[PDB]
Amino acid sequence: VYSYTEKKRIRKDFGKRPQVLDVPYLLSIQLDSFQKFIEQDPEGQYGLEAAFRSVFPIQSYSGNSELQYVSYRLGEPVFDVQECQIRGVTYSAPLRVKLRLVIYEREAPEGTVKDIKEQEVYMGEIPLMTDNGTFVINGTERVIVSQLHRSPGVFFDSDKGKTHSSGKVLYNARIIPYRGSWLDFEFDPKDNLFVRIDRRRKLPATIILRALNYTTEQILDLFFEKVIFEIRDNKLQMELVPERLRGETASFDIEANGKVYVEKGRRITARHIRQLEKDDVKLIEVPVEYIAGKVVAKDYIDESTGELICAANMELSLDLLAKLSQSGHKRIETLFTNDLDHGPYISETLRVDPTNDRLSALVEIYRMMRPGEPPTREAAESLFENLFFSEDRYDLSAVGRMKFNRSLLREEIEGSGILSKDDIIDVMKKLIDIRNGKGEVDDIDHLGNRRIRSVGEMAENQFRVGLVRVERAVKERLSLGDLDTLMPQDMINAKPISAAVKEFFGSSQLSQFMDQNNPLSEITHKRRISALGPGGLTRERAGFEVRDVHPTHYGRVCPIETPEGPNIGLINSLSVYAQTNEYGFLETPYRKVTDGVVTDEIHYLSAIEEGNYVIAQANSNLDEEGHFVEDLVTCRSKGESSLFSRDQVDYMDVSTQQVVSVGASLIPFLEHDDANRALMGANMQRQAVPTLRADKPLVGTGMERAVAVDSGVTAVAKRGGVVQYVDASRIVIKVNEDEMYPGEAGIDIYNLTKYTRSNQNTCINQMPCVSLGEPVERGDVLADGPSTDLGELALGQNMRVAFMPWNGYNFEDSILVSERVVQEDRFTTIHIQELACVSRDTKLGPEEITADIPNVGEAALSKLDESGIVYIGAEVTGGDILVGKVTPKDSSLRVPNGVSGTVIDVQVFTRDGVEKDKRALEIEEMQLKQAKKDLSEELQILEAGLFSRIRAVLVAGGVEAEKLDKLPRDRWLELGLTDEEKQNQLEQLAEQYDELKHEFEKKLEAKRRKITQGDDLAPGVLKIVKVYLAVKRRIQPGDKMAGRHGNKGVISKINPIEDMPYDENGTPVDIVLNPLGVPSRMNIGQILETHLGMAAKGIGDKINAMLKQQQEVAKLREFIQRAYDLGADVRQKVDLSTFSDEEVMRLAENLRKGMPIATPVFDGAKEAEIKELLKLGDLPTSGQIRLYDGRTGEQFERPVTVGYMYMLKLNHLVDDKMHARSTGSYSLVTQQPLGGKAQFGGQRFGEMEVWALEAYGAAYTLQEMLTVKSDDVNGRTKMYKNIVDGNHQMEPGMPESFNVLLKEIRSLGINIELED
Amino acid sequence: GITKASLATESFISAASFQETTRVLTEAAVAGKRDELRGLKENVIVGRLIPAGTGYAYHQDRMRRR
Amino acid sequence: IETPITANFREGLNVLQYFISTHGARKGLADTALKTANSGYLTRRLVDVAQDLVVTEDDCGTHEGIMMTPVIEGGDVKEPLRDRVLGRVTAEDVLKPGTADILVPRNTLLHEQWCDLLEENSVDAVKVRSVVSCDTDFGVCAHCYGRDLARGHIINKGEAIGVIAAQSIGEPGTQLTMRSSIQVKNKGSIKLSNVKSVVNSSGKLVITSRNTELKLIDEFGRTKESYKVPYGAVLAKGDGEQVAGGETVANWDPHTMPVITEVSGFVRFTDMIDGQTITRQTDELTGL
Amino acid sequence: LFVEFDPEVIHTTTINATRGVSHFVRFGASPAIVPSAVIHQLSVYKPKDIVDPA
Amino acid sequence: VPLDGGRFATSDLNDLYRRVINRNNRLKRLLDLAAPDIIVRNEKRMLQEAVDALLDNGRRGRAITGSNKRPLKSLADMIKGKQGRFRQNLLGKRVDYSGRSVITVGPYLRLHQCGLPKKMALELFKPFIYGKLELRGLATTIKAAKKMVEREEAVVWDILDEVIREHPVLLNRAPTLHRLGIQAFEPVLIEGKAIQLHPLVCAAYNADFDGDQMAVHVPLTLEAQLEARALMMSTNNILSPANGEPIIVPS
DNA sequence: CCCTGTCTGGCGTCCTCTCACCCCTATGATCATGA
DNA sequence: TCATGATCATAGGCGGTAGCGTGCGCCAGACAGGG
């Protein structure tokens, strides 16, 4: 079955793979993150409650006072979104917090407080998010963009090759906390182990192991095994486990049990280890040279002298053995220090250590942190407990603790946010294990190590920084005042909190201005994974590897939609199905392929769970049950594609559209384009402009409805029902009774957004697309937006294209367009410019906006009214007067030189106290009248719905067929009816009606207050006049058009109609492209799009022929059914036998300008299907029609390719780039011309052009190019007199900026001069 | 090498218009070094004719009248 | 990747093949970005090191120039003599091998007719005057530069050649990239250069030098093959002989450095004391 | 300003939250032990003037 | 500079000089009223560090800032590097009598001429038109001529066709790589708003027509017209200076 | 004094176009209202 | 008439009784460490 707007124009759909998971709501990152941020969240985390429970309770400097936390609450905003964008306020909500003050007594902090006080306090204004997913900061709609950064936890990197120039790789182990001090363990080419804290000075690593109160005996107990030597009657025998001897060449003949095992000069084989462990050999015999370099573990003391025989971690010599042998020790514990197995890295590290106990280690750490000051044991304890071991200054998140347990092979993924002793010891153990040769290092670009922050987490962090500044103020004030006399709003002030959050949302590196000229550009700017910003890398520094697609971007981050230029691969765009995990990583759906059958359950995999399993490719053929029809199937195991068996697979992809993003899944035939041209096509499809009447794509991907409905430019129905009143302003839906609340009678009113300014100076319009009396369903479009049509997404328009060289006018990439295109007004885009004029406050008095103006006459002032402001509707030229303004000297606002327009909307804002002039009172009466009429129509329309409910209830149960309309309509309650649900319902509707009466009274009073009041404004401004010009820019030689595949081009000549190549029917082609761009720039998808567009228009022409002849619905039903079946096993399977002879005529009314065809991305329409659809129309099979010429009237040889391509106009127009300057203004500090176009400036004759004129022999051209034309002021006035008198001659002089160089060098101690 | 061959000139304005300006101007400051505009780029700085094309004939005239 | 892309753009590409194509494409785009970033700075440093060099005289008055020979990597001759000695003033006047007969005088610009008359007589090495060996104080004379490139005649007195030179070197920096025996092909006389050779017992010619360079002199004088010959290599031929095509004339071992001798006699050990100077390591699984 | 206190056991960052803190007289990295010349041999002064500077 | 809001976001230099004068006046007052023995030392350290912030900020240990993270600009940051007087104001300058627009093809041109709009040719060539007006006697002063060419009356297009006729302009593509990147043409007036540029010539600019933008300059003086005709004309540079290959290869 | 490692200074394309942003918080003084 | 409270206007450089910094990289030449 189909929805009623899907019976208007049902898009033909090729495609073979039956879908199982539809496209999710495309704005779920922004909305879900900010819903996670601001919501009443119990059990502590996440949200604002995490900040308010981690920074509170503020306890004082031992004054026994404490400011603890209760709850919070956000009130309603004073301004809704529309008034906020008009006036210019933030769209914020006040953050009320309930704080409590308690004050303890003397001698008992575990005793009773004498007095508490709990109260409401005001702090900050956090800006809310609109339903589109955007913020309104100062009247300009802004987006905060998700950041891709390093995951907190341990990270074992390897500084490969480059250091020490000898190939010896290093290994470092960066512990990355979420908030606190970093910690980098590393090696050096002497194979010592070095710690460092926050990239500061370097210490040997075991100095922190003493700082955790470990003795050296315990350290060697941890980081090494033991070797036991027993002195038993002969040559100091040894306990030997032969696994340590795997490949070691002994120094003697190892024999045991009267049997020679190992010979001198040979090594111990593995089978000799098997012999020694099979015979269970324990004690072997060593020479005196064997313990010549063995390292003792613990301290041995002589019992008689009380001295030290040998210190810990010391090699043993002959005299040390002679001392400890005669003291009474039979057991000797040493360490195993092999070449391959276990290096003595800990032992060499302890030999570099000068420290000896806990205190000296804490002193040295306190000295490397803060240099050159007296340490004290209390200060060293406090610093080292506040580096890693305090809840305040150090905090891994849950993400950090998960990565730190997972990368150390733990079990519990839950732990504390602070470190401990076992954590650092496990980091050093894993680092030594990586140095030993077992285990692997971790790459950086792997998406199991890249977390995604969003709006909620970054706003929480900035709010937390505001709170630690305010706890730095409350700790100041709390124990330095008289108690009890103050309340907790005199202490805490809202300036740092609001300053922090307002600086983050106002100007950050990630809170950026929304590129809004297209529904696609909105919905793909909100889905952006930027690597830049705070905590990430920078553009002009890094690098190589991060600008490259890793093998685990498959289905998380789009590989082909990224901006080319200085930041490729850093401004990644997130894919279609890609959600965000609980912790912040990326996850993507798959289908659990149990042992034979592809089960239709979806199952979200992260980036590290994907690697262990094995995933089938998306388009693998399966026969109606899930059984894979091949016995070799293409899969990918561990980041590496291969060919696997039938039933060793564990997952299949969901749909074939999931590698790409929503920018580059509206490209039909994407699998035929080379990836560079698909990148340029997706980026230019983002850069489109909305035309006047947007049409539709004939060749789409079916993804248009998700991008249109799941954005916020169309007016989606909330509750379905029957339309009651359509208008260009409003739309009224009457809600069906099986969707309807019992109370609040309810018929909905959609106030559309008519002609208003977007951010890119386009024209964001909404047009109603429903008829009257028409049913609508829940979840359905009512009003099309900009670049939409019937709920689809129509960016550009589809035109008749031919690929042929035509007389050179399409030489490199140019485009040649018939005048039939510009006559139909079909690229005529509508732009809106906002021109502001402020009435400031200066000396000699304030300014005047009135029209009594000097130096002007009738010809200027005829287009102004009697109070200076231009009319609404006056079509002005470039350089007239819009607002007349004179200062205590003409300073009237003028149209900037070049642009026409029609003044559509004038706003006047008045700072309160200033006299409103007559036009400001006219606008006040106008908006009073509009808001009065609008709220009165709210009351009338909802009262009409309420009375219709009363009529619907009184059909039964005491019905009065004639007596109902004899009495006035406001008394439909006291009629004959007992105590039932109906009199209860009439009482509830009377409650609703009296609520509407008193609500209408109070809301009209509040709306008169909002219109009548002034507005807070800039320091020293009287009134602001804003005027909206509405230019209509058509098309001309110089604009940029482009298709959807990377075929760019400046349109080069707008030919007449007659010159166009026509065919043997009569129709001229509209646009003549260039064929030579196809084999080099390998975008072969545009030719398949051209042929399938010609097939679509062939079906449309046959419908137009079968309908223009007034044929009955039977033949239309026949032909539309044949055009909708037409293919292989497909998904569509429609039938017109359930459309009932009236929808088929209206469906053919919508198909007569062409039949829309969906072609999904990697499961598209093959060549034979295009041929069979070109055979259904009577077009030629090869797609090529023979074409005549317009000039000569004789045939082009070798018939050419025509069809329809869907081409977009880009907003790089030519009357926004063109500029010229004879003599304008000059800069102030260096007397050179200004830069730019708005400032009337000159083009930079840069350095390489100076080199290119030195490279010729042009000497006078360069002399006037940098002395006369540019800098020397007396030289250029002499030049201007000489040019207007006909004498071409220059008096050179000196550049004045060289005198500026002399003054800047001379302002140092340097004495530069000019000799002779 | 070309960056050291260009920083080691008998003309401090060329070596100042190239890389580090601090070291070049301090060395030429304490040495009392005296540029004589010596070619192309100093004359592009100071605003006169290049001694390459037509300005080469002008510079032969100017040097002959010295 | 060991499993290639068996699908072209006229047919489809499925998802993995298009993903691997994306690996290649984004690697290329990032190469072009950082490539431009280095190329512009290379052009800057070259036009700031040259910057000053103006063609300021008309004849320096020296003779010593560089020797232009066609480059020989060891295969086909890559850059011939016509494309190197095109338009540059000769250092010493070229005498054809009819010795004491002058072919060109010693200050003749070698334009296209003279280059064809060089190619006909198969002239070995036209010694020619270079900019680097000039004599003009504070500048470069006109004759040592050569033809005015981009024009036809000799260079005009004045055109700043340092700037056009530095732009011509740094301008194709956008196009550049960023990140057993001797087998003969042709036939001719055999030349050896810097060789110390001796006769083995087999009758061949063995070499006692690393600095040996083999050359193939053709029928008219020049050289079409050159080969660096290693130390102690064994030739199947000698000097001045004649070979045929496809004939490997030399063989050696790239793994072993041969310590071959000159005189024929017994071998004894001098200053070779066992245990210290030489050690006893018996090859276990072979025997020798 | 002259203040009497004791460096090590009472560490400075705890006391930082108050005034009296720009930093020690140093002439060097370490907080320099200052003389108290006024306290010891120069108690009572300012006969320069009461010029009330400017 | 005023920011038109009642306040002056000052330049960094006035901040630096203000810091030196504050610290110096406080040091004069502290040397006036006698320094407390081993005391007249911290203030001189502060003055030395403020002067070292003024002459070269950031060379001594951690630099200063006004707002917020960015270190502010001393004198050596005005002479050195990019954004300084050697590379931004003295070696490459902003230039009057110049303009820029988007290029296009127009193959009906001879190779020594390019299409150029009527609006750009009227705004580049203004004082030439003023001189021809008061030389032919169609405006008394300069102000009547300026108001005539602002109204664009029917006679100034004949004046403009009489001043374009034998007067070259310089076309320039924005990344000039080698010396063929600046060439000189003789303009032809075009109804439209783009620069029609001969196709063969676009082999030397490395310029396609997918949105490229080129800038035109005007040679004012007489010697510069002769240098843009004899040295830099588009018919003269047919050979590259890198080799002997022609640069007019048909593309 | 003769290496050999560390440290801190230099440097890292051109041209153009668009947009926002460019103190708020605390203390003191004056005026008005209430007792 | 006096006192207290509230509102408005005018005036300066981590904010705090610490700690923030952490994702470039190469070359080069001086300063110093080890022997």
Ligand SMILES: [Mg+2]
């Ligand atoms: Mg291009």
Ligand SMILES: [Zn+2]
């Ligand atoms: Zn010479």
